[PDB]
A paper describes a structure:
GFPs are frequently used as reporters for both in vitro and in vivo protein folding, but their (re)folding rates are known to be very slow (10–1000 s).
In (4S)-FPro-EGFP all 10 Pro residues were replaced by (4S)-FPro (theoretical mass: 27924.5 Da; found mass: 27923.9±3.0 Da). Apparently, such spatial display with preferred Cγ-endo puckering of 9 out of 10 Pro residues dramatically improves the folding properties. Indeed, 12 new interactions were detected in the (4S)-FPro-EGFP structure that were not present in EGFP. The majority of the fluorine atoms in (4S)-FPro-EGFP is involved in interactions with hydrogen atoms from neighboring backbone -NH- groups on their ‘own’ strand or on strands in the near vicinity. (4S)-FPro56 is the only fluoroproline having a Cγ-exo pucker. This puckering directs the (4S)-fluorine atom towards an unfavorable position as it is involved in a repulsive interaction (3.07 Å) with the backbone carbonyl group of Asn153 on the neighboring strand.
Residue numbers in the entry: 4 to 64, 68 to 229
């Protein structure tokens, strides 16, 4: 897959979610430039108002677009699984609140890199920081820790996202991730390393639908 990410690739994102019964759908389009670990996307809630804060959806809403330096190419599982793609599953535990469980398939459909997602959220407090919409519209920089999972011929991923709360406090979201290939072809199983992330959220001053504009940079490191 390395060769498939040398230039600007277009991206399409589709998420179907249900959090405590509140059903919703999100669509997103943009492009990724893995050579600069760059992502520019704009997401729309296609069913109306989003029943959770936009930032809680950022991790769910294409790590194959992370910049893997030359001396780490042999560790880029994400791109190695292309174009057949890979399944990405997660369990996001929101401290003192509910948890999201997600399953997605990211692969190529012609030239378009597609991320199809199903998200299920349960045990949220209808009046907590998530359902009550008390998280600020911003995003911090984190370190995504990656590990090989030889027995599953995939990887294991763990990290902690810190969502700023409107009162100055912090809402922790423990991420437990698993990625496995969709094809029966070989993939790169990586030594331990991590991805350094940063995201900036903004609004489109001409968009009336509930939405999020995301600019994100990610680069592999730790080796």
């Amino acid at each position: 897959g390395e060769e498939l990410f040398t230039g600007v690739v277009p991206i399409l994102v589709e998420l179907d979610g249900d959090v405590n019964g509140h059903k919703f759908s999100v669509s997103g389009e943009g492009e990724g430039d893995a050579t600069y670990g760059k992502l520019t996307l704009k997401f729309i809630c296609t069913t109306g108002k989003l029943p959770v804060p936009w930032p809680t959806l950022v991790t769910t809403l294409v790590q194959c677009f992370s910049r893997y330096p030359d001396h780490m190419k042999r560790h880029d599982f994400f791109k190695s699984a292309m174009p057949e793609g890979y399944v990405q599953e997660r369990t996001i535990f929101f401290k003192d609140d509910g948890n999201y469980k997600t399953r997605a398939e990211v692969k190529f459909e012609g030239d378009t890199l597609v991320n199809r997602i199903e998200l299920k959220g349960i045990d949220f407090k209808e009046d907590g920081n998530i359902l009550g919409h008390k998280l600020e519209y911003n995003y911090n920089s984190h370190n995504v820790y990656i590990m090989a999972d030889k027995q599953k011929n995939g990887i294991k991923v763990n990290f902690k996202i810190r969502h700023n709360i409107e009162d100055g406090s912090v809402q922790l979201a423990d991420h437990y991730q698993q990625n496995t290939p969709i094809g029966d072809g070989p993939v790169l199983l990586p030594d331990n390393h991590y991805l350094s992330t940063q995201s900036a959220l903004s609004k489109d001053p001409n968009e009336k639908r509930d939405h999020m504009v995301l600019l994100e940079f990610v680069t592999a490191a730790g080796i």
